[PDB]
Amino acid sequence: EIPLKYGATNEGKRQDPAMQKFRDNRLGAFIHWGLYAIPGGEWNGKVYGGAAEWLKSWAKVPADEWLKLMDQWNPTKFDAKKWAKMAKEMGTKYVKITTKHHEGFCLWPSKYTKYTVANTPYKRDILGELVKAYNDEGIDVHFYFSVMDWSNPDYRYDIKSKEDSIAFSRFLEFTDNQLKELATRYPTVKDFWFDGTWDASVKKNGWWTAHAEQMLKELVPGVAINSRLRADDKGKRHFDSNGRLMGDYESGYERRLPDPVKDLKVTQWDWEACMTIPENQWGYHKDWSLSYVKTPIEVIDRIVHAVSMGGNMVVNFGPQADGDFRPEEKAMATAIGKWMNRYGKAVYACDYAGFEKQDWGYYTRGKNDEVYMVVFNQPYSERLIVKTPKGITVEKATLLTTGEDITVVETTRNEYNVSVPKKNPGEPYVIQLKVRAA
């Protein structure tokens, strides 16, 4: 036991209604929208293959020159009602929005910097319009926020001097001011998801990370705060020096997921994964031929995978400079939405089922002990193997869409074959099991 002032304080999962809502939501969208949408991965005739939102770094653009992109910020097709409708039709229950990425441009009219939507031709408070539009559709809003800020020259990557320590304190005060502004201007915010907290400077200032968490919780009753924010007294991130989770949920799975057989430890805490559609583009990149682009089924598979292991999934979108979405993202959202409309009872408010993993897909568990079999890989044998835990029996199987009864045959002591449906559903599909415990 290492004594710590800025280590974990939550033991186990929060169970207040606000955390239950965060969890039950299950499926979210991410919006990465910032000045990077304008060049879209390309600078002075060179298309950089790295993540578009990091182009300032790939092309070594000075801050002042990068931020001049504000003079081109005029997303005339932006319509916050349409964005919220796209999200609603996709079946997302929440949206995480980049309020400020590393570049330092604010999507709200901050009074603490001039690098904001207010000082662009478009002028309008994008963040505020989205908050209202999403909330009107019954969709929760979470705020992404980059502590690392390339526009503020008081930022430091490490503290090598008295002068660095003083500048960095001032940077942290600046940061607090913007955070307070976000929390008070948009009081329906449900979560703050921090990024840009990996540098030695932040790791040396764990206390500030604890403070930011407490400060926002005081301002916003029930707000969630991601693990990525947090560093303890020693500079240990996400989990403290005693191995305890800091913040309200674990937030490292990014472009990867826990192993359904080997990583069952994740079921012990809330957690949230985020993913990109291409391999590694968050902001709008104009050229998606450069890497593998996931299909809707691949995305759905990840969504179900996360829920099957007690986690949320958040699918990223990188809106165009003009304020519309690219055709690939419209198609994706529509395809996810159609699936979720049919099969979402197995996703929303579901969780880990406690069954041994089978090859046909995933199990999820509903609030009233429903066990859903979500089938992604159809056996030529036409039999879906179900091995139940000790004391559990399967009493019925039903095809979710139609209510048709599905034959269940006991094959051994703890195992059944659940038949595939008489007609191949032609897409990943759900069989709902009624189970009984001794």
Ligand SMILES: COc1ccc([C@H]2[C@H](O)[C@H](O)[C@H](C)N2C)cc1
């Ligand atoms: C490996 O270092 C990284 C990778 C991704 C990021 C950023 C991406 O730009 C995106 O916002 C992702 C969610 N974030 C962690 C930051 C540092």
